[PDB]
Every structure is written in C-alpha cells, then in structure tokens.
Amino acid sequence: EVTSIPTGCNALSGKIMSGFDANRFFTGDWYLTHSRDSEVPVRCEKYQTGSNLQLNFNGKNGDVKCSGSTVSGNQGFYSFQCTTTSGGSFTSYMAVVETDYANYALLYRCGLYGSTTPKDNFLLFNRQSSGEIPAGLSTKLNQLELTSLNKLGCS
C-alpha cells in the first residue's frame, strides 16, 4: 500500500550515490557512531543485519527488531517495520547516501512516528565501534551542510 516516503521526508534526489549495492550493505554489523541530531545521553547502537532486510539493534529501551522492504516510488529508500521489547511498533524510512561497505555508511532516516511532522536525521555508521569521520566523506558532508556531526556513545 505505501509506495513512497512520508510527505516532508527528503527524497534526496540527485544527492544519493550511484550503484548502491544492497547485497554488500545489509551484511554484518553497523555501529551508529555519529549523527546530525542526537539525544542525551548518547548511546552506542549496534545494528545487526540478516538475510531479507531483517535487522536487530539495541535501542533506547530494549532490543528492536525490524523487517525491511524497498519503497517503489523512491530509489534507494527502504521502509522498516520495527517492534520493541516493551511491545511498541513503528515504521521508519532510510536511504544509504554514501558508503564504501567495508568501513562507513552515511544514511538518511525519516519517519512520522505518530505525528504529522517528520523527524529525520543524517546518520554515520561504522563497521568498528571506534570508527569516526572518514576522509572520503569530506566533500559530500560539506555539500549536505553536515559540517559538525555529533559523536555518539561508541568508542
């Protein structure tokens, strides 16, 4: 039924890497090490991936389990249906902006989470918990005006 990302989310047309390879991105673990907007206290979320766009991460209050699917109307975007250990449920949308698969991935995430106003973010994932801001993203970050990503709770 849902064939495009929520109204107000940034489709980022023209700003996403060419040739995104889902096969190489949705494997292994991804640490969420930095983000444009951040909460307090900062934490270290490890995103564990599995086949068929499944993922697990250690969320704000308990493990979170998500099942993904492509969004037909928006190239590069995925919809995740997530459930939480406290019994909650939500939908979240994401696109991989840039990645080298082996080290870092810059993502865009957006959702309504029950509101009419979207909450979004730019997220930097690393394969190591000690990962920081890669030299290779320098110009791309400048272009997106992401000049000062907040470091989170991983080291």
Ligand X SMILES: N[C@@H](CCC(=O)N[C@@H](CS)C(=O)NCC(=O)O)C(=O)O
Ligand Y SMILES: CCCCC/C=C\C\C=C/C=C/C=C/C[C@@H](O)CCCC(=O)O
Task: State the amino acid at position 18 in one-letter form.
Answer: S
By CB under 6 A, tell whether 118 contacts ligand X.
Answer: no
Between CA 67 and CA 139, with CA 105 as vertex, the angle to 5 degrees is 145
CA distance 155 to 11: 31
Comparing CB distances to ligand X, the nearer of 25 and 90 is 90
Pick from 101, 74, 102, 97: nearest CA to 143: 97
By CB under 6 A, tell whether 22 contacts ligand X.
Answer: no
Give the Cβ contact number of residue 18 at 10 Å: 5
Which residue in this structure is represented by tokens 């975007």? Answer: 77
Q: Which does 36 bind (CB under 5 to 8 A by kind): ligand Y, ligand X, none?
A: none
- The residues binding ligand Y (CB under 6 A) are 30, 35, 47, 55, 66, 80, 82, 92, 94, 109, 111, 113, 119-121, 125
Q: Which does 94 bind (CB under 5 to 8 A by kind): ligand Y, ligand X, none?
A: ligand Y
CB of 46 to ligand X, least distance (A): 12
